[PDB]
């Protein structure tokens, strides 16, 4: 149940990195399907920190994206990787 959070790459305040992890934790408690997890996190960050955020949630992917400075995080919640970033 209690998945270990492990931050792999962050360009954001330590405040928001804790918010990300906590918000992803709530999303994984509520939803099982990766697109629904990603939607919950994206929509919460659009609210809590203003648009436009994007979120990818998965067990196997690589990515290359462009993000505003101080608005990028990539972390594992258990065995699930979460990419969350602002662009636009």
């Amino acid at each position: 149940c209690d998945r270990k959070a492990v931050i792999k790459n962050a360009d954001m305040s330590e405040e928001m990195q804790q918010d990300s992890v906590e918000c992803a934790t709530q999303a994984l408690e509520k939803y099982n399907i990766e697109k629904d997890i990603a939607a919950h996190i994206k929509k919460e960050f659009d609210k809590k920190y203003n648009p436009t955020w994007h979120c990818i949630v998965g067990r196997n992917f690589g990515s290359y994206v462009t993000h505003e400075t101080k608005h990028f995080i990539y972390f594992y919640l258990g065995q699930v990787a979460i990419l969350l970033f602002k662009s636009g």
Partner: peptide
């Protein structure tokens, strides 16, 4: 002010 980033899963 923007930056490019890679990610990759284990």
């Amino acid at each position: 002010p923007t930056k490019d980033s890679y990610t990759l899963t284990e």
